[PDB]
Amino acid sequence: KDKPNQLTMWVDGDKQMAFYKKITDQYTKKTGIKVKLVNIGQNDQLENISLDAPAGKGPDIFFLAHDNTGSAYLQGLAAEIKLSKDELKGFNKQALKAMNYDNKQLALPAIVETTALFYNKKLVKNAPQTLEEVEANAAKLTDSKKKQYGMLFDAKNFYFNYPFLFGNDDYIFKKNGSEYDIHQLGLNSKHVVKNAERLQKWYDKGYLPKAATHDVMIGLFKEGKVGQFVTGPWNINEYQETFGKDLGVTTLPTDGGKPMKPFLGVRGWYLSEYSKHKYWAKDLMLYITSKDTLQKYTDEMSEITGRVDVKSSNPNLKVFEKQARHAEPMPNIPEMRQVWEPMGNASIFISNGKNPKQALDEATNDITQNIKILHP
Amino acid sequence: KDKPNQLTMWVDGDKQMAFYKKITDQYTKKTGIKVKLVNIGQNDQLENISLDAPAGKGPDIFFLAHDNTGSAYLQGLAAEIKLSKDELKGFNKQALKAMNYDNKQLALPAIVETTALFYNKKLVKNAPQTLEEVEANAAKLTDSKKKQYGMLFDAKNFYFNYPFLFGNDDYIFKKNGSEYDIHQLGLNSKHVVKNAERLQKWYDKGYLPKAATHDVMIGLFKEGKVGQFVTGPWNINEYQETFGKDLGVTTLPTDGGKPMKPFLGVRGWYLSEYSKHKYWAKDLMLYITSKDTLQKYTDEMSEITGRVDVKSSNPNLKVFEKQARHAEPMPNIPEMRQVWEPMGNASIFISNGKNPKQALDEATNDITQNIKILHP
Ligand SMILES: OC[C@H]1O[C@H](O[C@H]2[C@H](O)[C@@H](O)[C@@H](O)O[C@@H]2CO)[C@H](O)[C@@H](O)[C@@H]1O
Ligand SMILES: OC[C@H]1O[C@H](O[C@H]2[C@H](O)[C@@H](O)[C@@H](O)O[C@@H]2CO)[C@H](O)[C@@H](O)[C@@H]1O
Ligand SMILES: [Cl-]
Ligand SMILES: [Cl-]
Ligand SMILES: [Cl-]
Ligand SMILES: [K+]
Ligand SMILES: [K+]
Ligand SMILES: [K+]
Ligand SMILES: [K+]
């Protein structure tokens, strides 16, 4: 079980590749094992590996968005990684779960992302602690013609409205332990339906504009016409550039005392079943996911990582670090793919005045029949 | 006209880069000019070039989807390319137009794509020539709960329903010659409303299922439950493997005696304004888009190219070659980004029974509104 001469890794982008080269160069000085890096987009790595791995041209470790976890495993491409408690130490717990399928840890998280609550201090001086407070700010600051809104988020997209519709006891697929049951949908629960009725109420009160897309909301927020905006960290720098000290960022507030959890997206390192040096591949994977490495990663890339012990020096990103510890993984199973469009359609219908129970009942029916078609 | 030591090109993906190293290895033997290839995905190239070009570290030529032509030019990143009549010979005419902005040719088309009409010969023996017989096939082969449909396409998505809604004299943005006028929209013209009513009638007659997504439609077609399916060429191998000689492929039919024209998508090579060797970059661009190079390309990649003198050996792809010469470029201006979601929403509403004139009137007003906010 001694060292091989080389280990290959599939990195997502030229930017990350340049960063992991530096890191792996140090790995080579420490261990003597050379590391070959290949730039393959994460969106193309799963298809590519299914072809290259069986022919001996695949990598020892590769990189994917966590929602591909079940599919990667089911195809016999992603191998189980057995880890020590000491090796798991410092990793975001829900991030690990996001990369766990059939009760097996299939990857280590490198990058995590969620939404958070941005606010314009010139319009909202204090960080909203409750949803009732966010609503109160919506009521005060929303002006009809002036394009001024107290509260915005892309409520027609399930990704964004998720935390406003699903509480801790609600679910998409029922979890009978770690196993999502694909035949038990919670999309049309009494509680989700009530939250969806509230969402429609926000549309009825004029708090959420029907015509605006997520990109319009971004523009409006930058223009200084929006008090509160729930979105991802993608435009942090330009929001900081535009607002300076007036840019506020906070975690999602509590909803009736229970804290809101946005979707958690995770991207990270998988072990190839076709790797012939699984011990050392794992060793390299741990080295590139160490506190040291991922701290340098957050410093140099301004992204939140899968390590809770990594600390950005940007207080705005510190908020997303916290939010990442209080979030819910997008189900990592293939059937989750069937959920997005019907819930998106339901959300569009809700915004247009459709009875929310009917909208969600129809989405649930549609998801059920689509899963059967694509996954007998 | 005196050669540089090296030329740099940004390629979209590892697979394409492997193909262009071989071509450029030959280029270097002919000219003596070294070529450096870097793998940067086309969705990341504008942003990357925006930052690297000014620092003297950008490429000589880069690769984008034609939809970014206007933006690339407005930011002073893409340079005009002066071309001979003989240098233009063999290029798909609409593909060139897709890459032409402010009356300037800004790129040469490498890859093109449109939808076409697939049909299962066990259900539909002959290639349908007219929309009227597409419908007749729909009336005859659509059966309630056997999940059998004579006709399918993702009518909720504007990219797919476009040819069914817009005829030759209809338009998104009015073309005052070659340049689009962002303030004159045609999305709600009488003729388009009329086609939208026809589309609603296909939902009312049960020809198009409301619950199905594109991915479901793909599944149903592969199960042998669908007579006719309008979609792109992306799964052509899977369909061939499944049906063999029973896979029919034809161009979109005539509608009222006129050719239905789907959207044309083009991807290709732009010339960086920051290149210090524009003459020779142009030379390299012409070499990598020659009949010889693109013929080799279609052979190894199974993609349709921007050259009409390139012929695939696959008869199913020959159909796509022809379709690409009878298509309409997606408007290549930034304002087109505001069009997609509102038209998608209107299509969804139409599928749900909303009055099509209202649906399209609201989309039009929303687009007008969103364009003003994002481009003031
Ligand atoms: O349309 C459904 C779509 O939603 C999610 O995509 C997110 C993405 O994760 C974020 O990075 C950001 O761009 O917002 C997107 C909104 O769609 C799912 O992750 C994706 O799988 C799904 O198709
Ligand atoms: O958001 C809509 C989207 O429409 C077009 O995208 C097409 C794409 O060109 C095809 O390759 C295929 O995958 O269908 C896509 C839509 O489902 C536009 O190209 C794109 O700009 C636009 O965002
Ligand atoms: Cl509350
Ligand atoms: Cl000439
Ligand atoms: Cl006809
Ligand atoms: K944003
Ligand atoms: K689906
Ligand atoms: K397809
Ligand atoms: K938009």
Separation CA A291–CA A308 (nearest Å): 9
Q: What are the CA-CA distances from residue A16 to residues A12, A21, A207, B189 (Å)?
A: 6, 9, 40, 48
Q: B215 vs A156: CB contact, 8 Å cut-off?
A: no
Q: B39 vs A44: CB contact, 8 Å cut-off?
A: no
Backbone angles phi and psi of A253, in degrees to 5: -75, 175
CA distance to partner chain B, nearest, from residue A40 (Å): 6
Closest CA to ligand 1's atom 5: A159
Q: A337 vs B215: CB contact, 8 Å cut-off?
A: yes
Chosen for mutation from B36, B39, B362 (greatest number of chain A CBs closer than 10 Å) is B39
Closest CA to ligand 2's atom 4: B159
Residues in chain A: 376
8 Å CB contact between A289 and A266: no
Separation CA A347–CA A162 (nearest Å): 10
Separation CA A51–CA A57 (nearest Å): 9
Beta bridge partners of B9: B37, B61
8 Å CB contact between A120 and A226: yes
Separation CA B277–CA A246 (nearest Å): 45
Q: Which ligand is nearest to the CA of A329?
A: 1
Q: Which residues in chain A have their CB less than 8 angstroms from residue B220's CB?
A: 373
> Pseudo-torsion of CA A120, A121, A125, A129, nearest 10°?
40
Of A38, A216, A337, the CB nearest to B370: A216
A100-101 and A104-105 beta bridge pairing: antiparallel
Separation CA B106–CA B104 (nearest Å): 6
Of B14, B342, B349, the CB nearest to A39: B14
* Rg from Cα positions in chain A: 22
| Ligand 2 binding site (Cβ under 6 Å of any ligand atom) | B 67, 157, 159, 232, 265, 330, 340
Whether residue A13 lies within 8 A of chain B, CB to CB, comes out as: yes
Separation CA A281–CA A35 (nearest Å): 10
The CA A218 to ligand 9 mean position distance, Å, reads 10
Q: B211 vs A352: CB contact, 8 Å cut-off?
A: no
Q: Which ligand is nearest to the CA of B82?
A: 4
8 Å CB contact between A364 and B210: no
Angle between helices B158-165 and B340-351 (to 10 degrees): 70
Which amino acid type is present at position B94? Q
Q: Which ligand is nearest to the CA of A344?
A: 1
Q: A370 vs B39: CB contact, 8 Å cut-off?
A: no
The closest alpha carbon to B65, from B94, B97, B42, B89, belongs to B42
Beta bridge partners of B61: B9, B271
Resolution in A: 2.3
What is the 3-class SS of A44-89, one letter each residue? Answer: HHHHHHHHHHHHCCCCCEEEEEHHHHHHHHHCCCEECCCCCHHHHC
Q: Which atom of ligand 1 is nearest to the CA of A340?
A: 2
Q: B213 vs A147: CB contact, 8 Å cut-off?
A: no
Separation CA B229–CA B226 (nearest Å): 7
Q: A374 vs B219: CB contact, 8 Å cut-off?
A: yes
The answer to whether the CB of A159 is under 6 A from ligand 1 is yes
Using a 10 angstrom Cβ sphere, with 0-12 exposed, 13-18 middle and 19 or more buried, the burial of residue B146 is exposed
Size of the A and B interface in Cβ pairs below 8 Å = 74
Closest CA to ligand 1's atom 17: A159
The answer to whether the CB of A130 is under 6 A from ligand 1 is no
8 Å CB contact between A199 and A165: yes
- The position carrying tokens 């890191």 is A23
8 Å CB contact between A151 and A137: yes
Chosen for mutation from A57, A216, A365 (greatest number of chain B CBs closer than 10 Å) is A216
3-state secondary structure of A225: coil
Q: Which residues in chain B have their CB less than 8 angstroms from residue A219's CB?
A: 373-374
3-state secondary structure of B87: helix
Q: Which residues in chain B have their CB less than 8 angstroms from residue A48's CB?
A: 14
Separation CA B145–CA A125 (nearest Å): 58
Q: What are the CA-CA distances from residue A200 to residues A117, A352, A359, B114, B339 (Å)?
A: 20, 8, 12, 38, 24
The CA B256 to ligand 5 mean position distance, Å, reads 5
Whether residue B219 lies within 8 A of chain A, CB to CB, comes out as: yes
Separation CA B92–CA B108 (nearest Å): 10
The answer to whether the CB of A203 is under 6 A from ligand 1 is no
Angle between helices B190-204 and B158-165 (to 10 degrees): 110
The closest alpha carbon to B222, from B152, B157, B125, belongs to B152
Q: Which two tokens stand for residue A303?
A: 């992204």
Q: A373 vs B216: CB contact, 8 Å cut-off?
A: yes
Q: Which ligand is nearest to the CA of B156?
A: 2
The closest alpha carbon to B306, from B91, B41, B88, belongs to B91
Q: Which two tokens stand for residue A364?
A: 């649930």
Question: How is residue B80 annotated by DSSP?
Answer: P
Residues in chain B: 376
The answer to whether the CB of A67 is under 6 A from ligand 1 is yes
Q: Do the first three CATH levels of B1-114+263-331 and B115-262+332-376 match, i.e. the same topology?
A: yes
3-state secondary structure of A215: helix
Instruction: Search chain A and give the residue with CA nearest B38.
Output: A14
Chosen for mutation from B345, B355, B358, B368 (greatest number of chain A CBs closer than 10 Å) is B345
The answer to whether the CB of A345 is under 6 A from ligand 1 is no
Of A14, A341, A369, the CB nearest to B39: A14
E-state strands within B293-376? 328-329
8 Å CB contact between B111 and B64: no
Whether residue B237 lies within 8 A of chain A, CB to CB, comes out as: no
Separation CA A91–CA A308 (nearest Å): 6
Q: Which two tokens stand for residue A164?
A: 């406003």
Separation CA A320–CA B200 (nearest Å): 45
Beta bridge partners of B271: B61, B79
Backbone angles phi and psi of B184, in degrees to 5: -125, 100
Closest CA to ligand 1's atom 13: A232
Q: A211 vs B369: CB contact, 8 Å cut-off?
A: yes
The closest alpha carbon to A38, from A55, A60, A56, belongs to A60
Using a 10 angstrom Cβ sphere, with 0-12 exposed, 13-18 middle and 19 or more buried, the burial of residue A185 is buried
Closest CA to ligand 2's atom 7: B159
CA distance to partner chain B, nearest, from residue A83 (Å): 32
Does domain B115-262+332-376 fall under CATH 3.30.9.10? My reply is no
Q: What is the CB-side half-sphere exposure of residue A300 using CA atoms within 13 A?
A: 14
* DSSP assignment string, B240-257: HHHHGGGEEEEPPPEETT
Separation CA A240–CA A221 (nearest Å): 12
Separation CA B182–CA B167 (nearest Å): 19
Separation CA B343–CA B367 (nearest Å): 9
Pick the CATH number of A1-114+263-331 from 3.40.190.10, 3.40.50.620, 1.10.10.10, 3.10.450.50: 3.40.190.10
Separation CA A275–CA A10 (nearest Å): 13
The CA B88 to ligand 4 mean position distance, Å, reads 9
Of B210, B212, B370, the CB nearest to A213: B370
Q: What is the CB-side half-sphere exposure of residue B316 using CA atoms within 13 A?
A: 24
Chosen for mutation from A341, A350, A367 (greatest number of chain B CBs closer than 10 Å) is A341
Question: How is residue A176 annotated by DSSP?
Answer: S
Question: How is residue A3 annotated by DSSP?
Answer: P
Using a 10 angstrom Cβ sphere, with 0-12 exposed, 13-18 middle and 19 or more buried, the burial of residue B358 is middle
Of B14, B338, B365, the CB nearest to A40: B14
Of A220, A337, A366, the CB nearest to B373: A220
- Which residue among B159, B213, B303, B347 is best mutated to probe the pocket of ligand 2, counting the most ligand atoms within 8 A of its Cβ? B159
Instruction: Search chain B and give the residue with CA nearest A225.
Output: B373
8 Å CB contact between A288 and A269: yes
Q: Provide the H-helix boundaries in chain A.
A: 14-31, 42-52, 69-74, 85-88, 93-98, 131-141, 158-165, 190-204, 214-223, 236-243, 278-288, 291-301, 315-324, 340-351, 356-374
Q: Which atom of ligand 1 is nearest to the CA of A330?
A: 19
Q: A369 vs B211: CB contact, 8 Å cut-off?
A: yes
Give the distance from CA B35 to its chain's centroid: 29
All structural domains of chain B with their residue ranges: 1-114+263-331, 115-262+332-376
